[PDB]
Amino acid sequence: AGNATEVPANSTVLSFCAFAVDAAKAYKDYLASGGQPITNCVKMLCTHTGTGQAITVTPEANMDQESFGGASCCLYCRCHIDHPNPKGFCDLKGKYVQIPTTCANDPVGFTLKNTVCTVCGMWKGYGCSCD
Amino acid sequence: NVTGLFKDCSKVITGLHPTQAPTHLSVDTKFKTEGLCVDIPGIPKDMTYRRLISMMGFKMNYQVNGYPNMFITREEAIRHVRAWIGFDVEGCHATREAVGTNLPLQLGFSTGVNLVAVPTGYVDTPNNTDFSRVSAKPPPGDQFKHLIPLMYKGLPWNVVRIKIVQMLSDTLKNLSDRVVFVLWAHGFELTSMKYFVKIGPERTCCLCDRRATCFSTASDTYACWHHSIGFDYVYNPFMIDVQQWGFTGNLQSNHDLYCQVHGNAHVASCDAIMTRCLAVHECFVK
Ligand SMILES: [Zn+2]
Ligand SMILES: [Zn+2]
Ligand SMILES: [Zn+2]
Ligand SMILES: [Zn+2]
């Protein structure tokens, strides 16, 4: 009964992060000890002619990005654990997230370590036009 | 191919919208094409769902520098016999809005304590995971009839985990710097530990120099067994599955080979008592 969501290659990392006091730190440490990034994310086909904004209603990848389903790039969604916002709600689930192609092998790690600029809507260090 | 860890136990026939699915597998088939997924104009997200996610199938085989491993060898367990706490959980089954997973109901320990929890599960929603009461029932069958009255005697998990920490602390503070849970067929006990165990690097107590055995979500602090009053999580426990030592057949038949003083009272604490007792006879007697 029921429908699987996960694949065996993610069992170790998801179990570790689901039990961790500090899930973001656990994922960072897991990778530093040689673990493989979380796979089985929701990667989109698109036209690569989008705005390049980080978090969007529909896929918005430019030629330097890939578009993913937002929940699938969120460690807290993937592990089914509490989110760190004040009210415990997610800013990725229900949106698409654009990830630089150079980091698309590890979308979850990318979102954990990076910040969206609230002025221009692009990732700090990966498109933000503000300086 | 697939695992049962985080299986979606809802009865919703379709999968999720690409923005809401945790995984590619969980996206509905209508969005899947050409090896990946597409956004479909005019096909909306689902803004009201509640999908129960199963916690059966954890695998604690991580190897991460500075994080102790939870499962220990027989030889290490023997050195820590004074830390041994037998542990067993009797479950109830998800029903109604979900089916396909086991929820902790009666948590039993070799101290003789049984704690009863409200049936509680991890429900994915459009905004988060909601750790919440879920519909449940005891398994059918005469051997499970004693669970029927417990369905109405459960405590919320925030209360249950405080009581677990207090019991372990009272029992172990003058016996060990750790706990070793002694298990028989550990899968569901490991699932149940998700409700009251956290892990991380080794830490020390907020109030002395001992290793931390407990964690508080109220203050993000760590304590040993002497200083854990009010703490809600067990931190970096250890554990071992006695069933893996070569026995065949059920727990009771193997326990009874060595011991006549623990008649089977058919309750979680009695399984926990038998498990620790069997382990002690196997390793320390004759
Ligand atoms: Zn999330
Ligand atoms: Zn900017
Ligand atoms: Zn202390
Ligand atoms: Zn006995």
Beta strand B233-235 with B197-198 is: parallel
Method: X-ray
- The residue count for chain B: 286
Residue type, B65: N
Interchain contact, B62 vs A12, CB within 8 Å:
yes
Interchain contact, B9 vs A77, CB within 8 Å:
no
- Report the catalytic residues of B: 88, 90, 189, 266, 271
Helical (H) or strand (E) element with B269? helix B268-284
Sequence ranges of the domains in chain A: 8-113
Give the separation between CA A72 and CA A97, rounded to whole angstroms.
9
Candidates B1, B25, B61; nearest CB to A5 = B25
Separation in Å, CA A19 to CA B70, B166, B283: 11, 20, 30
- Alpha-carbon distance B188 to nearest alpha carbon in chain A (angstroms): 14
Cβ of residue B37 closer than 8 Å to a chain A Cβ: yes
Residue type, B190: L
Beta carbons within 8 Å of B207's beta carbon, 6+ residues apart = B223, B224, B226, B227
Place of tokens 């407990």: B214
Number of Cα atoms under 13 Å in the Cβ half of residue B236:
20
CA dihedral A58, A63, A64, A65 (to 10 degrees): 30
Nearest CA in chain B to A46: B38
Give the separation between CA B3 and CA B187, rounded to whole angstroms.
14
Give the separation between CA B205 and CA B212, rounded to whole angstroms.
5
Q: Which ligand places an atom closest to the C-alpha of B128? A: 1
Residues of A with CB below 8 A from B99's CB? 1-2
Q: What is the resolution of this structure in A?
A: 1.3
Interchain contact, A15 vs B38, CB within 8 Å:
no
Nearest CA in chain B to A47: B38
Give the separation between CA A67 and CA B193, rounded to whole angstroms.
36
Give one word for B107, left, alpha or beta, with left for phi > 0 and alpha for psi -120 to 50.
beta
Beta carbons within 10 angstroms of residue B176's beta carbon: 17
Separation in Å, CA B212 to CA A11, A56, B179, B195: 27, 43, 11, 19
Whether residue B109 contacts residue B87, with contact meaning beta carbons closer than 8 Å, is answered with yes
Give the separation between CA A112 and CA A76, rounded to whole angstroms.
10
Interchain contact, B22 vs A5, CB within 8 Å:
yes
Residues of B with CB below 8 A from A75's CB? none
Interface test with A, best of B3, B19, B69 (most A CBs within 10 A): B19
Nearest to B4 by CA among B116, B129, B101, B127: B101
Q: Taking the CA atoms of A22, A78, B158 and B138 in sequence, report the sign of the dihedral they define.
A: negative
Q: Taking the CA atoms of A87, A38, B5 and B126 in sequence, report the sign of the dihedral they define.
A: positive
Give the separation between CA A38 and CA B143, rounded to whole angstroms.
42
Residues of A with CB below 8 A from B53's CB? 5, 80
- The residue count for chain A: 131
Residues of A with CB below 8 A from B193's CB? 19
Beta carbons within 10 angstroms of residue B76's beta carbon: 12
Candidates B19, B66, B129; nearest CB to A80 = B129
Separation in Å, CA B55 to CA A15, B59, B127, B233: 10, 11, 19, 18
Interchain contact, B64 vs A3, CB within 8 Å:
no
Distance B56 CA to ligand 4 centre (A): 29
Distance B214 CA to ligand 3 centre (A): 10
Task: Specify the DSSP class assigned to residue B204.
Answer: B
Whether residue B94 contacts residue B143, with contact meaning beta carbons closer than 8 Å, is answered with no
Class at the top of the CATH hierarchy for domain B74-284: alpha beta
Number of Cα atoms under 13 Å in the Cβ half of residue B57:
21
CA dihedral B221, B227, B233, B235 (to 10 degrees): 80
Size of interface A-B (CB pairs under 8 A): 184
Q: Residues of A forming the annotated binding site?
A: 74, 77, 83, 90, 117, 120, 128, 130
Whether residue B216 contacts residue B249, with contact meaning beta carbons closer than 8 Å, is answered with no
Burial classification of residue B132, based on how many CB atoms lie within 10 Å of its CB (0-12 exposed, 13-18 middle, 19 or more buried): middle
Nearest to B26 by CA among A17, A69, A100: A69
Burial classification of residue B105, based on how many CB atoms lie within 10 Å of its CB (0-12 exposed, 13-18 middle, 19 or more buried): buried
Give the separation between CA B262 and CA B233, rounded to whole angstroms.
30
Whether residue B118 contacts residue B154, with contact meaning beta carbons closer than 8 Å, is answered with yes
